[PDB]
Amino acid sequence: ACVFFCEDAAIIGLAV
């Protein structure tokens, strides 16, 4: 698994 990142601005990581 690895961490994707999105913009909310804050950086949010999502583990997949």
Residues engaged in binding its own copies (CB under 8 A): 1-8, 12-16
Q: How far is the CB of 5 from its own copies (least distance, A)?
A: 7
Going by C-beta distance under 8 Å and a sequence separation of 6 or more, which residues neighbour residue 8? Answer: none
> Is 15 one of the binding residues for Cl ion (CB under 5 A)?
yes
Any idea how long the chain is? 16
Q: How far is the CB of 15 from its own copies (least distance, A)?
A: 8
SS3 of residue 7 by DSSP: strand
Q: How far is the CB of 4 from its own copies (least distance, A)?
A: 5
